[PDB]
Amino acid sequence: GPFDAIKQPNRSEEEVTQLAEDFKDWSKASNGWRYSFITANEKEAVEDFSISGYQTANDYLRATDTSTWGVAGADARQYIRTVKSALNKLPKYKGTAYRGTWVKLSLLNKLEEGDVLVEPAFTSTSTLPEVAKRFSVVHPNSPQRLKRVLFEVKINQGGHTIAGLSEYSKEAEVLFAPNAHFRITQIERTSNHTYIGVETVKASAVKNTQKYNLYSGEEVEA
Numbered sequence: 001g002p003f004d005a006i007k008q009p010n011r012s013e014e015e016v017t018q019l020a021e022d023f024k025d026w027s028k029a030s031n032g033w034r035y036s037f038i039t040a041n042e043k044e045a046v047e048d049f050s051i052s053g054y055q056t057a058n059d060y061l062r063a064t065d066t067s068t069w070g071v072a073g074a075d076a077r078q079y080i081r082t083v084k085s086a087l088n089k090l091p092k093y094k095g096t097a098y099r100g101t102w103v104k105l106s107l108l109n110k111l112e113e114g115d116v117l118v119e120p121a122f123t124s125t126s127t128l129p130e131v132a133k134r135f136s137v138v139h140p141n142s143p144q145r146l147k148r149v150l151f152e153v154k155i156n157q158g159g160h161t162i163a164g165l166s167e168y169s170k171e172a173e174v175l176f177a178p179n180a181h182f183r184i185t186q187i188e189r190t191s192n193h194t195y196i197g198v199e200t201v202k203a204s205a206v207k208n209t210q211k212y213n214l215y216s217g218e219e220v221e222a
């Protein structure tokens, strides 16, 4: 049953909450020597990323022209740099994670196994499909048709757990720095939903395939 971990009914609140707490505990217990260099500003930035910080950071990273942001752009650049610095001091996660989002139908209709998807913003994922699906429920106004997409992400690089610092949100969250690349390993289009299996890949390792910007739908040059 491909993607049944996503499709199937959700586990109970008790189980999902316990799994998220275990993941937070594991994250803290996995802090390494690099964590001893984390700063107060980095902790403040990561701790509030999931509730509000990601909204501004990801808009800046998706902006067509950042000179239009004025003074807020300087703040956004500082925040992005701080979160990226913090991430490299936090434990890696490898294994499977999940991401719910909305993607342009016009891009989805082009996608094949082996294509590479590039996320210009930070990429937020959860180890829990229940949490990922929560971000597939509504979208803001769009003149282009958007479709619900549930990603099953095989992570072998790039992902770091922020769950140890996210005291105020128990989402079992694994975060990627901006511009993360994901190679499609399987696609299913069924009952108006789209399920995509992807594997993390290093940008410099991507060769002789087609890259697409996941947000804009535009081709990304080799």
Ligand SMILES: O=C(O)Cc1n[nH]c(=O)c2ccccc12
Pocket: 050, 098, 099, 100, 101, 123, 124, 125, 126, 131, 132, 133, 135, 171, 173
């Ligand atoms: O990028 C976003 O809009 C947030 C987000 N989207 N999708 C997810 O699956 C997810 C999981 C955990 C924490 C944030 C998220």
